[PDB]
Amino acid sequence: LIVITGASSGLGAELAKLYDAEGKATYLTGRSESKLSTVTNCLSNNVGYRARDLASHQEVEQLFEQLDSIPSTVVHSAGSGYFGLLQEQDPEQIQTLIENNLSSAINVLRELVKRYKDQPVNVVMIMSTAAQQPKAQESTYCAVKWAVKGLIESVRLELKGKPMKIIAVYPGGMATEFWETSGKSLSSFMSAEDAALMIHGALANIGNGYVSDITVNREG
Amino acid sequence: LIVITGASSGLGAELAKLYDAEGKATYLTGRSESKLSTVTNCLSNNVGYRARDLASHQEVEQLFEQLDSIPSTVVHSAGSGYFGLLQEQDPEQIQTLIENNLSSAINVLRELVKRYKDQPVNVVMIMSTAAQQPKAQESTYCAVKWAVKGLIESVRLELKGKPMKIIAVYPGGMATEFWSSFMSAEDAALMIHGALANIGNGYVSDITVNRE
Amino acid sequence: LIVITGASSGLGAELAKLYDAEGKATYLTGRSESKLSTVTNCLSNNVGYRARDLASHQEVEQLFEQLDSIPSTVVHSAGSGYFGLLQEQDPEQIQTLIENNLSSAINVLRELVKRYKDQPVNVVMIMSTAAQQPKAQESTYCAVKWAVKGLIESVRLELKGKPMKIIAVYPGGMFMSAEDAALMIHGALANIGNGYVSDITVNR
Amino acid sequence: LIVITGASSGLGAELAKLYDAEGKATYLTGRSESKLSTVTNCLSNNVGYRARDLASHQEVEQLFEQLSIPSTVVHSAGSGYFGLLQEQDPEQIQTLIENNLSSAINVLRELVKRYKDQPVNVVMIMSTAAQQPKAQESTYCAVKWAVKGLIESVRLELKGKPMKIIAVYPGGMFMSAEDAALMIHGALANIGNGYVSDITVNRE
């Protein structure tokens, strides 16, 4: 079983399609049941979807309780962008950023470790290149993405000797959440389709080595 | 004028006593009016204190709104610890942790940039060596300290060319991250206070203080 | 053409085997002429090899001057280990460690940028997880691996707006086998549509 | 006793003057005996100086052989060299590696060998170049990153020993050697149960 968050659009939905196309069972979550339906009606081996607000620890606990089996992979791709000079940023929108990126990540990973730490699960945490450097006009975005990286690098240490593993993925140059201060009318981006193809290829480990951390970037 | 947050106790209280001794005017904030008064009884040049919840951006706006002049240094030392293996951590307490560390840091820094980016204010952001490395049983605490590091490294890029500077401070080995051999708030404060220097065309932009 | 350094044995040899097996032409370099002969005897699409001291800028300049074509990929896997508490390390071996790891990476990447920065070459720089963290009893190995990461991260900034790309690879201790790391590295590196895998870390 | 490398001029020379004014005994080394003489003529508490090539482990071994046990060792020896990597001269790159990385390794190794069980504060002065990549500074970044990998590794090896490594990262030396000296000398402290372990100094 492959559980995918943020699966109603973007990288999460494109990953769903590649796993489904390999014949594998997927369970999809996102905020919009309407959008989830449309993704899931392209699939042929999908075993469910459920709209959830991952910023709610109660909703995340129910998400995993209702599954029929232990997932073999969980891909966390939920998140959102918000940008601008710090003094121009709206605090309510900053709070939403924290909820959608950091809270969602903490609630999902905590629930995974609670339930499945002694199970061979591959937890794929999708972050952003913003997790690894600072960026002008992205201060709170970097803040929440750096927060997720500190979380996963710590939890990796708590998972020493356990079969659960965390895989860190850092995309850059996708629509999902990019910020240009000027440009021509928006090949401006790495498509979700192509990012998902590369991420999926790298995670398909056929030997005794595995890819623990991967960065994928647009060329330009 | 030196504005100190987190000044009810710990590092921020001990810093206030050092600035005060040099004959510098302080304005203190913390969550307990009562603890703030006890700190202020130690001081002879204080120009006021006020309880504030820094997680509220409106309270932070009003904190700086009621000041009679432009601070020369602002010391942000507000924060709290919470610890344990992640499965053992209580979600409500994790939410409090995010509030006390990340929300408070964001609100204070945002308000400082808004009002004072074009003034020579030294903004001293006190974090933790948890901001610099991952630590087992401190995953959400690392998360919020890493978050604050990313915030400030990004705002430093926005402040290019401007007179406002952010100074990053990373203490480790203090009692407040224990989950006699620890470094004391008074010792850490003497070191941070001594080290903070702007001499000639330079300044100490980043400092790490540890126990040995 | 795929040019592979450090291909006398270990990871570089194993990668050469994988590329060869997809039908791609390779050209190998390493310290041992005889080990290179042995590796290439296994290969069916190899177009040569040349023993070289990569610590010598002259020998590296010759390596690339003798080549007939602009390579499409260059895989830099030359390196060596040496371990121990710093006080127990021999300075003569520390100097060999700097030559094999840092000097080699500098000379190869310098020659590549000099000749090919304006060509769509994928330069795959293999370092170590020792490039990303400090390690007790590996202080000088961390030193040379960190050096290489500082180098490549700086050159990436110089290559802004140019077609040459640097791909960073961080394998754990090899512990993995050289064969297992090669499989995963070869399997993960990709350039699809508008994007590419820029950095990978591989562990057991 | 404060032993200072890179003391023939610049930052090490300015630090010597500060410690000397406090009445502290200094022993100075650098590349030029003549410049060391000029610096030491300003001092009233100096107990010697000696020209040394720190890239030579034998000369470093003898530097410490002929010396009491130092209380602080300040390592400020180093040098700069810049330019796009393809424009850099490989002989100047080799000099960069010798002056920065070999010097740091030899000094720190000798110190750990001799004094790891003594309360010595070892102040390793690097550069903000150690902390980030920089275009036109690829090899300088390489050597400074290398030293940071070295020290962060040796710090793990020193866990539970009285010797402490202090990391200093100067940036922008419009910042003068004199004012960088003041803030560094000003910030280092071992008050109570704690110490300043890492300092970054930048220009206003």
XYZ file of N, CA and C in Angstrom, chain A residues 2 4 11-26 39 42-43 45 192-202, chain C residues 192:
102
model
N 0.524 2.244 -0.888
C 1.189 3.546 -0.934
C 0.187 4.646 -0.540
N -0.324 8.565 -0.076
C 0.159 9.834 -0.575
C -0.671 11.055 -0.107
N 2.768 17.250 -7.643
C 3.676 16.137 -7.550
C 3.020 14.896 -6.940
N 2.221 15.125 -5.889
C 1.492 14.037 -5.225
C 0.573 13.275 -6.167
N -0.149 13.989 -7.042
C -1.114 13.360 -7.989
C -0.354 12.625 -9.100
N 0.723 13.259 -9.592
C 1.578 12.639 -10.644
C 2.307 11.423 -10.114
N 2.742 11.452 -8.853
C 3.323 10.236 -8.241
C 2.245 9.139 -8.123
N 1.023 9.536 -7.761
C -0.055 8.551 -7.674
C -0.185 7.791 -9.019
N -0.172 8.533 -10.124
C -0.359 7.948 -11.453
C 0.754 6.956 -11.814
N 2.015 7.276 -11.487
C 3.139 6.379 -11.819
C 3.116 5.109 -10.966
N 2.730 5.232 -9.704
C 2.641 4.051 -8.837
C 1.454 3.167 -9.289
N 0.303 3.791 -9.548
C -0.872 3.088 -10.062
C -0.559 2.337 -11.369
N -0.058 3.052 -12.375
C 0.469 2.449 -13.618
C 1.406 1.233 -13.420
N 2.099 1.122 -12.284
C 2.906 -0.077 -11.972
C 2.078 -1.158 -11.329
N 0.759 -1.018 -11.382
C -0.135 -1.943 -10.704
C -0.270 -1.808 -9.190
N 0.343 -0.803 -8.552
C 0.349 -0.764 -7.075
C -0.859 -0.040 -6.443
N -1.342 -0.573 -5.326
C -2.449 0.061 -4.595
C -2.012 1.381 -3.932
N -2.782 2.436 -4.196
C -2.629 3.765 -3.588
C -3.875 4.201 -2.755
N -8.698 12.783 -9.588
C -7.400 12.107 -9.662
C -7.623 10.615 -9.618
N -8.751 8.539 -12.672
C -7.698 8.146 -13.630
C -6.976 6.855 -13.252
N -7.153 6.390 -12.026
C -6.407 5.257 -11.531
C -7.253 4.013 -11.686
N -5.970 0.871 -9.834
C -5.641 0.048 -8.635
C -5.793 0.801 -7.302
N 5.396 18.934 -12.758
C 5.120 17.888 -11.792
C 5.282 16.475 -12.364
N 4.855 16.303 -13.620
C 5.007 15.036 -14.354
C 6.475 14.624 -14.386
N 7.360 15.537 -14.775
C 8.792 15.172 -14.955
C 9.493 15.011 -13.608
N 9.207 15.908 -12.662
C 9.721 15.741 -11.263
C 9.343 14.400 -10.699
N 8.068 14.030 -10.902
C 7.553 12.782 -10.334
C 8.265 11.601 -10.992
N 8.550 11.707 -12.298
C 9.263 10.617 -13.031
C 10.659 10.382 -12.439
N 11.397 11.460 -12.226
C 12.741 11.391 -11.600
C 12.753 10.902 -10.165
N 11.789 11.361 -9.365
C 11.694 10.982 -7.952
C 11.347 9.510 -7.882
N 10.325 9.123 -8.630
C 9.940 7.730 -8.720
C 11.083 6.807 -9.184
N 11.756 7.149 -10.272
C 12.950 6.389 -10.692
C 13.993 6.158 -9.596
N 14.392 7.218 -8.894
C 15.383 7.137 -7.792
C 14.920 6.315 -6.569
N 15.215 14.557 -17.233
C 13.901 14.373 -17.883
C 13.204 15.728 -18.080
